Amino acid sequence: STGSATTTPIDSLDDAYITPVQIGTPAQTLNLDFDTGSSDLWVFSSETTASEVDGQTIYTPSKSTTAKLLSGATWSISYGDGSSSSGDVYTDTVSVGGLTVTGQAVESAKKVSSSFTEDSTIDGLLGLAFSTLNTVSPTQQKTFFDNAKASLDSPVFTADLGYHAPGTYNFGFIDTTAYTGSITYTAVSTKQGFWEWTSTGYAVGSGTFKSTSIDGIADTGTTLLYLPATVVSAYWAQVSGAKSSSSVGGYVFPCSATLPSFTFGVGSARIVIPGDYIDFGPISTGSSSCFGGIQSSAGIGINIFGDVALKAAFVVFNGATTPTLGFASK
């Protein structure tokens, strides 16, 4: 089997991407944030605190003939921006782009924090990191991919995120029309539960390539590119007027700037992030100070190849016995 679903930016800045997901019988379609940095599928629901829901679409398990409460199971998770959600669990039928999994754990939100409530475009998350990070207690649950893996033509999924445009998530196959050149595969460590790999270096604009190992994660659920302070200083030093601002929370630059590209290494191959991809617009409405898309990971504890980087490539999450990651230009 295979699945193929379109993923759409939630706003003009590609702050995140949503993908429609069918849950239950009859189907209830919710727009989820596919997150290769976590391993929980949770949704806004009929159980969510009423005051904490504002325009999201909710899952109502009582209207689904295939929903079953997973007795005694609870869950609780937090994300990079300090948001969080928690609740109980049902099992139900979940389909993504024509690919169906029965008995998927669907984690039902009783509580979400304000950032979730405040974002009406995201109805929940669908985690695609390794199942060892799943938060369900006392019986940890598997991710949609892990449940589907045995059925897939090939035990892979691919992320093809657009720049200010829709993209695609495919399950079970690699679309050879979706990329240029060849795919370069690189080793993955799963010891922290992430799609953790090691980049071979970087370049800033038309600058020479610096060979240096940068360990980090491939994370569709992080918007920006978070890299060591040395690397990020080297980038912003090429932009007149750029500066790191503690009040704003990172590097900002004159909105009048033309940004240089950023290249990252994958084995002997190179992925180029166009400068426009690194522009996240005014820090506040009407401001002429713009927020940078490359930021320091100092303080986070890990480097993060977020959407800014992943959208410059066609990315293969290979969930074979020994998982690997593949990157091609497109």
Q: Name the segment binding ligand F06 (CB under 6 A); options: 2-10, 86-94, 214-222, 278-286.
A: 214-222
Is 38 near ligand F06 (CB under 6 A)?
yes
Residues whose CB falls within 8 Å of the CB of residue 101, separated by 6 or more in sequence, listed in order: 93, 94, 95, 144, 147, 148
Is 76 near ligand F06 (CB under 6 A)?
no
* Residue of 45, 64, 86, 199 with catalytic role: 199
Residue 41 beta carbon to ligand F06: minimum distance, rounded to whole angstroms: 12
Is 124 near ligand F06 (CB under 6 A)?
no
Q: Residue 128: phi, psi to the nearest 5?
A: -135, 20
Residue 297 beta carbon to ligand F06: minimum distance, rounded to whole angstroms: 8
Is 35 near ligand F06 (CB under 6 A)?
yes
Contact pattern for ligand F06 over residues 282 through 311, marking x by CB under 6 A: ------------------x-x-x-------
Q: How far apart are CA 98 and CA 20, in angstroms?
A: 11
Residue 35 is among the residues annotated as catalytic for this protein = yes
Token pair listed for 141:
């649950």
With respect to ligand F06, which residue has the nearer C-beta, 221 or 260?
A: 221
Token pair listed for 40:
């929980």
Query: Residue 262, SS3?
Result: strand
Total of residues contacting ligand F06 (CB under 6 A): 11
Is 80 near ligand F06 (CB under 6 A)?
yes
Q: How far apart are CA 304 and CA 226, in angstroms?
A: 5
Applying CB under 6 A, among 79, 171, 179, 251 the residue interacting with ligand F06 is 79
Is 37 near ligand F06 (CB under 6 A)?
yes
With respect to ligand F06, which residue has the nearer C-beta, 79 or 280?
A: 79
Q: For residues 194 and 127, is the Cβ–Cβ distance under 8 A? A: no
Q: How far apart are CA 21 and CA 183, in angstroms?
A: 28
With respect to ligand F06, which residue has the nearer C-beta, 252 or 304?
A: 304
How many Cα atoms occupy the beta-carbon half-sphere of 106 within 13 Å? 33
Q: For residues 13 and 103, is the Cβ–Cβ distance under 8 A? A: no
Residue 66 beta carbon to ligand F06: minimum distance, rounded to whole angstroms: 28
Distances (CA, A) of 315 to 18, 210, 234: 17, 23, 26
With respect to ligand F06, which residue has the nearer C-beta, 136 or 204?
A: 136
What is the number of the residue whose Cβ is closest to ligand F06? 37
Residues whose CB falls within 8 Å of the CB of residue 178, separated by 6 or more in sequence, listed in order: 158, 160, 168, 314, 330
Under rule CB under 6 A, which residues in 215-274 are in contact with ligand F06? 219, 221-222
**Residues linked to residue 106 through DSSP beta bridges, in sequence order:** 90
> Which parts of this chain interact with ligand F06 (CB under 6 A)?
35, 37-38, 79-80, 219, 221-222, 300, 302, 304
Instruction: Report the catalytic residues.
Output: 35, 199
